[PDB]
């Protein structure tokens, strides 16, 4: 059955679309299946089952339905390029606060479209959200002004926090775990729960979280510097985490805004992201995106990219999100990876496809993570521009050869030498931590640095 | 850097770690990347990836964190197969209860892993689950058993359900949409939201609730039967899927067990899921798996096939779940499939990989749906074994020429015609109904029945 | 929850698992924290099902939560030291709702990994099914003991 006709209006602008601000805009990589119907019938299909219709014509439909159509109005076959305007009238809201849901919009603009047969694959690169529909999402309420604020940080441009993932991934008891904690922040700031981390049976939750603040104790009052911990809080069951975030605030006490609660926001999902944001607004959200590759890595041809995934995380209101390495670390990112950053950081920003203004909606923090380490960093911030960020380096801290502590450090001196525009290797003979950093991972040393040896 | 000799043991046996029951497995299709490790080092570093390790040694290791490795014990170069054994002492627990949660497994084994740099993909097509952890899952509260027998059926193979979707998927105002499922249900027995229907500001979710109440009431009292419908409650919010909970059982009263919520698990999330499964044990927890498509799909490489889907699902406690219509309906799927019906509702059944022992929890129902119609149903259900399942067919039965009402009586005469092992031709013609359906899709009716209107 | 639910815990057949062996804990009241849990780690060593006596509970020489870590610990040495699963039901019988979720609440926490092990006895004759139904409906997954003290008072065949 063709719906072209229907789902199909390539007369609109995008322009008077935006101009309206009555519409979402999506924008998709699409190939249809081979055997079926062309690039604007596969394209009209996709639209009907993204809002109003099914894969054949029904007698309830009215004119009334019809008015709230989802509509492609500009495709491009040559570049497998395919804009869907939906009404902003579709999307779910809550009937307790009046609020939107990204679940609706999941369901609606990603959802059944990635099971239709006629199809090969399609992927949303970007999408424009706006003002009536965008001030309906809650936004994050804690930046890393907030963290800023702790460390004794200008509240604006704070700079750079250092910081960690306690490694091993799994495997520490509480107490030894809690000593990897002190030892780290006798250089660092910032320390985050690996992912997995939280009531495992030979590291019970309780037992660990007092062990941690027992540390955060003895690191704060030994350096005299503000101290912050990142804590899993993650569960199938909305009360495990209210239990879990209770439980830490109360017994970190005087100490309890240096804390940030950290959701596995893809595995999880949305309700538990929402869960954390909405019963513990006053603690910064960290949104860790495990398992986000299964769907976001350029080897995918479906879903949605990390850039669409990092722009919804802004939405639903994380403190901050993983964005990647930017191609500078172990895991998949590319450069241009940068322009993520910008999308969550600032008021306004362009994406793929769209310019998206925030409305002064507060901004999403890039937590750069994933093999980086001191010797990797300044060809990281060369690429973005700012340090005013956090960066977690789990390998890359207790990987250093003279232990968590030197890592640390090594991960400050590194980007207090890209601030100061030094020569890394130069820089090296004035700053001890940093040159043992060279010797600590020396195969990446030899192809950042060639001739370090010499000096 | 070769992780091998620690996260690697081939001398291991499946059948032996199965019956230490202390492992869970995972069977992988995998490919490295070029220009990294070799096949046995990139799974090394996969299982390091999901357990307890990282891209570099750290110092912080000890003997007990290596006692607790998830260890590759087989792989199959040729097959790109790879299967990996996790200490079910990994997995996080839920503080409260002491319970498992789904949020941990996919963190771990299909978390960062599908963002590693060396590896093109990777996807999970099975795994098992011995009863240490098995037993620690919620399962399901509800059956298909007590659908059965609020349709006042045999609670032992009590049947087939005939089911729709109402259709637009949005449009419809509060009584249209009620007199959709007034029409349907002097046929039919399940009605379904379609997954985004909720609180549209054309639609307001209070006002919806009871125009369909009222609509039971009226049906129920003019065909003497039960009618069943299932409510979308999904939401971002937890205690917006409470509120809508509540208030439809407060609405319904008296058919409060008539109800079943539907969730939208797959975007919402396994906390969304949870919710409805923990808050509302007693009413039929109905889950679509709308967006599944984005990893599910045979044309993925990555994440995980709609038989881990559906197998996962069971442990989150699903009364039911959309398994597809196994290549006889407009999504993509395959005959195969049947293997996935199986797993969810017998108490012992073999995966792709693994066998299934599930210790008497609960079945999930196989809910059929896709681009459903009387006239695909004999079909389906020959390569099944039985219709002891709900199925809905939107566009099948709103599609029909004759109405909603004459659309619900094709698909029970259609199931009817399957019972008797009848030809459908020969029984259409003492069954008006499911003859009308040849004339409403006569390109199904063409492809399937080639000289069908002579008789 | 039903008998199901402890044949599997007890890593018996879920279809006729068979014979759960049990014991009440003797003294009815009069035992403190440590010797409660002291025979309970002794009975444990050949059976499988302890249950409080019906009354036991908070009273002032045996304190509600120092029992129940107590016993906590001894289901842990006694399961480490047979190899065996072990079971436990815990009086949480009160008239106040809300006391009936602390107690409920408290002892699945401090059990964690053997919160499957554990059953919750109500005196739901003497308390009511109002007290049953708080049990049935918070903790669905926790096996509900009910206990009928008290019943003898109608239910005797002397009682017309
Ligand atoms: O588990 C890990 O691998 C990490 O702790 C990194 O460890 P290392 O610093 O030791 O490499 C992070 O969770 C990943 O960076 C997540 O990736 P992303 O930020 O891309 O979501
Ligand atoms: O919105 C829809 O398309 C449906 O209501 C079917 O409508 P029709 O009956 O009109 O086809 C179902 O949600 C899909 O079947 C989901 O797919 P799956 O079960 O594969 O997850
Ligand atoms: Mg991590
Ligand atoms: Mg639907
Ligand atoms: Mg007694």
Known sequence: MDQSNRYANLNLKESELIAGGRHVLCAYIMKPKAGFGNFIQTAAHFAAESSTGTNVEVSTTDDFTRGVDALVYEVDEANSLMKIAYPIELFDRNVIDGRAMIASFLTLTIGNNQGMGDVEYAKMYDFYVPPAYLKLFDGPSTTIKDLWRVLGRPVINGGFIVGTIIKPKLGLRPQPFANACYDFWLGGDFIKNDEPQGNQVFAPFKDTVRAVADAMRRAQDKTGEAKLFSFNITADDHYEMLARGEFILETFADNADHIAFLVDGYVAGPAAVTTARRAFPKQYLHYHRAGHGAVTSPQSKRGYTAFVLSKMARL?????????????????????????????????????????????????????????????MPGFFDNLGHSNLIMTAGGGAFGHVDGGAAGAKSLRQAEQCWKQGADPVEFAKDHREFARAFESFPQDADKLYPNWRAK
Chains 1, 2 share one sequence.
């Not at 998949?332 to 993520?340: F, L, N, T, Y």
């Open 316 to 376: 639903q209101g994380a403190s901050g999100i993983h964005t990647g390495t930017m191609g500078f670390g172990k895991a998949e990112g590319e450069a241009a990876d940068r322009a993520i950053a910008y999308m969550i950081t600032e008021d306004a920003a362009d994406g793929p496809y769209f310019h998206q203004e925030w409305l002064g909606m507060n901004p999403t923090t890039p937590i750069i993570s994933g093999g980086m380490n001191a010797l990797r």
